[PDB]
Design a protein around this ligand. Structure first.
Ligand code: Q09
Ligand code: Q09
Ligand code: CLR
Ligand code: CLR
Ligand code: CLR
Ligand code: CLR
Ligand code: NAG
Ligand code: NAG
Lengths: 455, 455
């Protein structure tokens, strides 16, 4: 029947292995270079060559992250009006290499005096490197997501679903290689070697495209029809980025095992726990949910898969507040010392691996909501305005990130006092996970109404 | 359009006010007589005239409740094969009056010696009264639910939806008048007056029918298509009846305010808290969800409204375990004494009205799942086999009640120890609400697959 014709299209890519594989390898090397900057930027700026304060190093990363979301609609509109796609990603990866090159030069003591030898020490050389990398990320993310799906666009809307499974797989594989390997080198071996590795990862990502150019391939009503879907995701992004911040804070105050008898393991390894599960669950989805949910006709659309992923975000926030209520009860009796990075944390005597049911549930959530979110921004976009809708899709991702940071500033005031105090043992973090479960539950009920009124 | 034609049918009952109103008043007086027996049966049998043990009084109520679920398919098949509907409810309410009459006779000291004057003291007079009342409830519930919807069956499947709103409203109104008024009289005034009131409520329910007779009005494939829906509700009934038991246990160990300066308020008032909210939320649904969800085309089917009600059961179980973790933390510091019934309870100094967010969520759940559950058992039944499907619908309601009681026996063993100990301050009741949230969440995901594969 029609289910057999869709399962026949599941045998996809069919000759376009080098066309799609050049896109997967480019984004694998671009995510490997993004977490080369983001993981140890504050440790680098608040260090021995640069004597910046802790607030000035954190506000430099906050303006860097916000520039990767603010520049996405402009980096995608420029790929529609003036340039193409492939000329816009080659232009951006050239600028993403130029700003990236300043970080091995500032790390080296020989080349540091050439840039800024004669409050902030080297602010013209540092902030100029953050602008070119930040505008490089925003233009790539807006443009590499439709362009990779344009190769398998010919084989229906089901082959593009299988592309975003392995596109989101190589994003997480590039994050494991950067947060695991490169972030270990930047803290314990050298910043000179540790920033030269992601700069080579940009240059290889530029070469894979020039080697890969040989194999590559009513609307006003369509704009106002999809803006209420993106506005309904702003409370979803709020819960999403505040789990990434606060599950790491729960991991720091929990008993982390030691690995050897270069010491003092990085704090970027605690952000890997989400992405390790995604490497295990995408081959599980691609081989047991592309078959199984298709020949039973179950859950075919992209907007209903976002609502499934919203269900496992809420179940993760409950499982986090249950563990945090147990941990705050257990930290009153005894408290052990552990050092993560270069600061000691007062951890309870409860194992780190009790945080695994939190990461299964946001793991399963990104299996559904994150891959189908890329499918909706691609399919529900006009042909002239693709990658400018991807630009707005990651702009409202950043709007939810800053209103989530303002939510943490709201529960930190003296009137509420949930986050009044690097120690959270006097904070009520479990009450904040229960608030995120209530915001996510109201977001789920709101999104189901928007999803039906969209169709 | 078609939404205006459905809103025109929302102006329903249209001349059949006395036909439906005789059915609403009969079930109001039948629920008032059911909780006249159930609320203080154990206190009556374990009392001054009858010297039964606490186990023998509880097993008499457990065989009584199980007989109201076991006899429902047989009391409804008898209303299809041999008798009609109205001749089956008049026959059952005659037997529901005959067994009910033994309870004022055993309560009175003059007429007690005539029945059983010369282990268990008066077991032939007591168990014979429980059989006729128990078979009377099972035959009425199987038959009064299709028969009331047969009056407004002519005006489409939307007028029957408005019947089960006010049919389920008068069930809860009959429960407030019995658990509030009659259960107060049975414990503090007299059992003679206190059981004579629900016996008059049966006799008035028999007279309203004889006064109301003047105004009243492929299938083998249809059986096996709806059995997997009833089997998928067995984990829903498991969580449903175990919340009714364990929210009362949480209310007993929580600070209940006093009302006067007849003392010692009944324990049946703590079961009223669910039904008081239902009296406030059914006029809210009938006047703001029959309009609003209809002209927006939102959530039209009965099986998707059961899945909405399954979502608020799970959110109630989380809100219950969060309050119970706070209460067990607070009971370690200080503990007050309060007497409910005739036994003292060691309550924490936390107010009873913090249990209100638990009862809003199961309140909203019965607004969706309980009314739409009656609609599915009526609409998805063959015309020859109606009220035998209602009989199976309340039989699987009872299967979930006894497998829920076996779940409490499973978490009470020494290997798990969540319910190893009338005191729950040494028990982990919060871990049992979190288990019920996990069973309900897996039931929701199971029911959505069954609901799609049904359609
Ligand atoms: C309902 C909305 O659905 C979503 C749709 C799209 C995306 C999404 C996300 C990213 C990303 O930035 N992924 C981060 C990696 C893993 N990451 C590593 C550190 C710790 C936390 C962990 C999540 C991303 C990147 C590059 C190009 C596209 C991208 N599209 C997410 C959700
Ligand atoms: C997804 C399944 O959906 C449901 C469908 C039907 C029913 C249901 C239920 C009853 C009942 O027995 N209601 C009890 C009253 C209130 N009750 C009073 C004490 C404390 C607890 C509180 C719930 C009932 C009675 C008489 C005729 C029909 C009836 N149909 C329930 C759920
Ligand atoms: C009782 C008070 C709180 C009103 C409750 C309204 C909430 C609880 C209910 C009522 C209307 C419901 C929505 C109506 C719209 C739809 C479309 C339906 O096809 C899928 C479910 C979905 C998304 C429902 C989600 C839950 C919902 C929002
Ligand atoms: C989708 C939403 C509605 C899910 C419900 C979660 C929220 C609203 C529920 C879950 C647990 C509930 C809490 C249960 C226990 C307590 C502790 C008590 O000291 C104050 C009330 C309070 C704080 C309740 C507030 C409301 C509450 C937090
Ligand atoms: C619908 C479902 C997902 C609701 C979630 C309930 C389950 C998955 C959550 C609720 C409470 C959570 C628990 C919170 C506390 C503990 C105690 C600790 O010693 C081991 C982890 C453990 C056991 C967590 C396991 C997962 C957990 C039981
Ligand atoms: C990743 C592992 C746990 C597999 C997860 C399967 C669960 C989480 C998902 C996968 C398939 C999904 C179901 C597929 C069938 C449907 C019909 C769809 O129209 C409504 C939702 C519903 C009812 C889905 C509920 C959630 C569901 C059961
Ligand atoms: C943990 O660190 C604190 C801070 O110096 C110290 O007072 C305490 O003795 C340490 N405890 C252990 C067990 O090392
Ligand atoms: C509560 O009851 C117990 C049981 O007799 C008793 O020991 C205790 O003193 C009582 N406390 C108060 C405050 O009455």
């Amino acid at each position: 029947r029609r289910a057999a014709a869709a399962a026949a299209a599941a045998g996809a890519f069919a000759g376009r292995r080098a066309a799609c594989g050049a896109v997967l390898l480019t984004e694998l090397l671009e995510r490997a270079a993004f977490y080369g900057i983001t993981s140890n930027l504050v440790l680098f700026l608040n260090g021995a060559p640069f004597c910046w304060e802790g607030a000035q190093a954190s506000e430099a990363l906050l303006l860097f992250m916000g520039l990767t979301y603010l520049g996405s609609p402009f980096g995608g509109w420029l790929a529609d009006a003036r340039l193409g796609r492939a000329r816009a990603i080659l232009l951006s990866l050239a600028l993403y290499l130029l700003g990236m090159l300043a970080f091995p030069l500032l790390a080296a003591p020989a080349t540091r005096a050439a840039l800024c030898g004669s409050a902030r020490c080297c602010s013209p050389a540092t902030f100029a490197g953050l602008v070119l990398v930040g505008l490089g990320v925003a233009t790539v993310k807006a443009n590499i997501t439709p362009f990779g799906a344009d190769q398998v666009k010919d084989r229906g809307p089901e082959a593009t679903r299988r592309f975003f499974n392995w596109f989101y797989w190589s994003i997480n594989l590039g994050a494991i290689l950067s947060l695991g390997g490169i972030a270990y080198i930047q803290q314990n071996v050298s910043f000179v070697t540790g920033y030269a590795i992601p700069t080579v990862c940009v240059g290889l990502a530029f070469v894979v495209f020039l080697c890969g150019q040989s194999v590559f391939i009513e609307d006003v009503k369509a704009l106002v029809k999809i803006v209420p879907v993106f506005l309904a995701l702003i409370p979803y992004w709020t819960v999403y980025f505040q789990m990434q911040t606060t599950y790491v804070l729960q991991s720091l105050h929990l008993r982390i095992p030691e690995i050897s008898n270069p010491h003092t393991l990085p704090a970027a390894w605690l952000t890997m726990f989400d992405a390790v599960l995604i490497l295990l669950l995408i081959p599980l989805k691609d081989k047991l949910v592309d078959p199984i949910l298709r020949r039973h006709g179950l859950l075919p659309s992209s907007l209903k898969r976002i609502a499934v992923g919203m269900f496992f975000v809420m179940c993760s926030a409950f499982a986090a507040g249950i563990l945090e209520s147990k941990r705050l009860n257990l930290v009153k009796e005894k408290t052990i010392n552990q050092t993560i990075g270069n600061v000691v944390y007062h951890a309870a005597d409860l194992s780190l691996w009790w945080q695994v049911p939190q990461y299964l549930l946001i793991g399963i959530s990104e299996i559904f909501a994150s891959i189908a979110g890329l499918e909706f921004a691609y399919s529900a976009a006009p042909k002239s305005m693709q990658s400018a809708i991807m630009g707005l899709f990651f702009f409202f991702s950043g709007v939810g990130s800053f209103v989530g940071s303002g939510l943490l500033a709201l529960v930190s005031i003296k009137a509420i006092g949930w986050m009044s105090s690097g120690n959270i043992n006097g904070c009520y973090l479990n009450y904040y996970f229960f608030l995120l479960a209530a915001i996510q539950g109201a977001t789920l009920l709101l999104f189901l109404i928007i999803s039906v009124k969209y169709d």
